[PDB]
Write a protein that binds this ligand. Structure first.
Ligand code: ATP
Ligand code: MG
Lengths: 331, 331
């Protein structure tokens, strides 16, 4: 290890492929290259599912299972349930004083999410405010490295800003996190959309059976205009190729089909058939690992409970420093 | 001691005659017919004093001394420091999901403070959502009665909507608070301005010496058109008479003074000299206890560290039922 790295997910359901290439395999490797913390954004998940609390509770354990099956080792990663670290809420309140409503209003990502949900001015306060809640997550765990989708840059930058303003006003005891850009941009949905999500129903979950994964690939959007094999096709906008580009290890092999497909002797079926196995291959182990844990549920609970303790420990240490730096009565 | 009453002050400076008339007298009455809780809201004080943490820190004990000087009984009233009870922060973040930015922006009292503050759009997030942290305060301490001036009713009503929203969404575990309406008009400042404030420089601190109180009353605004004693003068708008209606034990003298003043020949001197006698009678006992408690710093500290202990446990319980009600992982 070396730097402290904070990553996480909003527990709203099983993890899928987009996550995988999105980060899961990234943290799998940074798992021994540093101190990795994985936050099950229990609380942030409510700024959206405040009306479906049952849903969240159920998915904390489910995502943790996903995490383990994906290759994360209990011995090298601290899994933390946000709600069980009240210290984060404390720090969020303090942070709220360091940013203006107008600045929160110009966050491009939150503005897009807001328009998509049709909230309008009727945006729940908790949601409108989740970016600073995230900054608190980062700062409380002392994270210096935060993998970030292109999409989550505004938030990351807001965190540095707030940390910076906090150190100047009070005392310099918080670290400015630095970003870890990724290569594969947000993996698209089977739909052909930009985002894969259980909500959009265009996802291949990490728990899906060989049968399903194959069925999901076969219904995958490809290329209209390309009606029959013979015909020439084009890779731009074709999810299968941007799937191979993120799950297929032999690029020479990839750029291969990319030739033939532009030509006309590579039927979308053959492209699919291939890719379906490139996925079964990347998934095969994950499936077996899941069964093991599924049979040792006690161990998943362990992973969550032990890590949450460890992490609260860390949050508690930072808050002590934050409370004294702020000159709060008593310390 | 039947219904739990919650009240408070954001610790920003010393208390003055305005708070005495506006809330303290009533609070000294409440400690005998209810269970009184007073919140030294240093967290809330930070929503706009985030740039002056020293000022806030220092005023927690100073206002505490003022509560005591005023007559609040350490054996009757629970005095708690908001900072020292993180459960409130934890509760406010959950409450943020039960309210819309839209509805928060509509709060008439906060809209007016922002107006007077001249923030513009540059409103600090924390300050914009402070009515919810107050809602969190009420619900956590499980207060069923909250003393309120019509200026704080929208804060109170929102608390009501929130609790109502929380019980219907999770489980009916929070008590709905009820208002204890008004304290009759707010005490105007020495130069007659609508508001009495240290900031405005037109106040009489509870801690002001009997001499100072005399001086301050002498230089009080009266009636622009009243130029000499012989002249007739107006009562309305004349704070010397507004102060008399709020503190003069016998309205017979008051009404008599009013008569002879509109008549003519009754100068500001004879009236003011009589205000001085009525204020010194209301203030003298407050000055003695204040000085007394100054000799006993430990007794003031005991007042707050114990109310806080009590408060912390009460909030702790409520969060217990809140967490379970919310179906939070592990509850
Ligand atoms: N298409 C994707 N590409 C890369 N990462 C993704 C993708 N979808 C989700 N993630 C990641 O998974 C985590 C969860 O975030 P989030 O809950 O917003 O996903 P979502 O797809 O928008 O789900 P939903 O619409 O069900 O709430 C984050 O780490 C996020 O970056
Ligand atoms: Mg989402």
């Amino acid at each position: 290890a070396r730097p402290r790295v904070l990553t996480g997910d909003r527990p709203t359901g099983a993890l899928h492929l987009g996550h995988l290439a999105g980060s899961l395999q990234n943290r799998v490797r940074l798992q021994d290259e540093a101190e990795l913390f994985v936050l099950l954004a229990d609380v942030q998940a409510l700024t959206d599912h405040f009306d479906r609390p049952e849903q969240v509770r159920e998915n904390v354990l489910a995502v943790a299972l996903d995490y383990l099956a994906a290759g994360l080792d209990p011995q090298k990663t601290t899994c933390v349930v946000q709600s069980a670290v009240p210290e984060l809420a404390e720090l969020t309140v303090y942070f709220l004083n360091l940013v203006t409503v107008s600045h929160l209003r110009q966050n491009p990502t939150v503005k897009a999410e807001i328009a998509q949900k049709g909230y309008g001015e009727r945006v729940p306060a908790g949601f409108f405010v989740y970016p600073v809640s995230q900054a608190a997550d980062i700062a409380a765990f002392g994270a210096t490295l935060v993998p970030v989708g292109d999409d989550q840059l505004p938030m990351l930058e807001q965190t540095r800003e707030i940390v910076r303003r906090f150190n100047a006003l009070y005392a310099p005891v918080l670290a400015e996190p630095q970003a870890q850009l990724s290569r594969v941009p947000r993996l698209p949905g089977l739909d052909g959309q930009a985002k894969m999500s259980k909500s959009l129903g265009n996802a291949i979950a990490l728990g899906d059976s060989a049968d399903e994964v194959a069925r999901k690939v076969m219904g995958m959007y490809t290329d209209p205009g390309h009606l029959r094999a013979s015909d020439p096709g084009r890779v731009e906008g074709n999810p299968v190729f941007t799937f191979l580009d993120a799950f297929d290890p032999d690029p020479a092999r990839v750029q291969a089909l990319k030739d033939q497909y532009r030509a006309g002797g590579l039927g979308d079926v053959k492209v699919k058939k291939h890719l379906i196995d490139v996925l079964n291959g990347v998934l095969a182990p994950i499936r077996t690992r899941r069964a093991e844990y599924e049979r040792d549920p006690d161990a998943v609970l362990r992973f969550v409970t032990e890590g949450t303790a460890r992490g609260r420990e860390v949050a508690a240490q930072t808050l002590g420093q934050v409370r004294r730096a702020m000159r709060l009565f008593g310390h």
